[PDB]
Amino acid sequence: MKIPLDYICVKSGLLCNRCQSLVEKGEVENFEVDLLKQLIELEETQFRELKDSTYHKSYKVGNLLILIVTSGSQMSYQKWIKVAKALQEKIGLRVRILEKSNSIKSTAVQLLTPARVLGVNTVWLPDGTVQYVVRISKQEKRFLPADETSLEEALSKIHSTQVRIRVE
């Protein structure tokens, strides 16, 4: 798989100066480094298809890991759910693979699944700052994969903007 650190460094535990700086800089957070270990482990052992994918900056919020990726032409959406459960056993936290997307409506549909989303509103302040609102049926709120405020923080981090959930 394509990643932001050296395979040797990640698997070694011993970082070259270049990788170590990335971790100090914060570009590869510490929990991201653990993912990279378990990811490379999980492709040598279990998923040759992983080597076609691409790692992307990933976020952690509370008990939840959100992994952003680009799936290679080898990676079944099923296999990603398989990869998620693999990660969720090696690491303690819950794992959610989201494929990297540039619209906020795409990544909100993926995360909030199994719940279904009603719609997404963009809004532009007089400031010009853009905010987003993901509408969900009251029924669906019971199907959210994590409490609504953690999903809000998650979505807000990924797209570096304000994201809010309206249970209407």
**Distance, CA of 26 to CA of 20 (rounded, Å):** 10
Write b or e for each residue in 53-80: b if 16 or more Cβ atoms lie within 10 A of its Cβ, otherwise e.
bebbebbbbeebbbbbbebeeebeeebb
Q: How far is the CB of 115 from Zn ion (least distance, A)?
A: 40
Give the span between the Cα atoms of 35 and 3, in whole angstroms. Answer: 10
- Of positions 4, 6, 57, 109, contacts Zn ion by CB under 5 A: 6
Q: Does residue 37 touch Zn ion according to CB under 5 A?
A: no
Closest approach, Cβ 8 to Zn ion, in A, equals: 7
Task: List strand residue ranges (DSSP E) for the chain, in order.
Answer: 54-61, 64-70, 94-99, 119-124, 130-135, 162-166
Q: Smallest distance, Å, CB 40 to Zn ion?
A: 13
Q: Confirm whether residue 19 is marked as ligand binding.
A: yes
Figure out which of the listed residues 19, 28, 40, 151 binds Zn ion, where binding follows CB under 5 A.
Answer: 19
Secondary element (H or E) of residue 42: helix 30-45
41 binds Zn ion (CB under 5 A): no
What number of helices (H) and strands (E) belong to the chain? Answer: 6, 6
Q: Which residue has the tokens 């809010």?
A: 164
Residues 64-93: x/- map of binding to Zn ion (CB under 5 A)? Answer: ------------------------------
Contact status: 28 vs Zn ion (CB under 5 A): no
Under the binding rule (CB under 5 A), the answer on residue 16 touching Zn ion is yes
Please check if 147 is assigned to a binding site: no
Kindly list the distances between the CA atom of residue 83 and the CA atoms of 5, 23, 71, 120, in Å, as whole numbers in the listed order: 20, 24, 12, 29
Is position 9 an interface residue for Zn ion (rule: CB under 5 A)?
yes
16 annotated to bind ligand: yes
Q: Using CB under 5 A, count the residues that bind Zn ion.
A: 4
> Binding site membership for Zn(2+): which residues?
6, 9, 16, 19
Residues that bind Zn ion (CB under 5 A): 6, 9, 16, 19
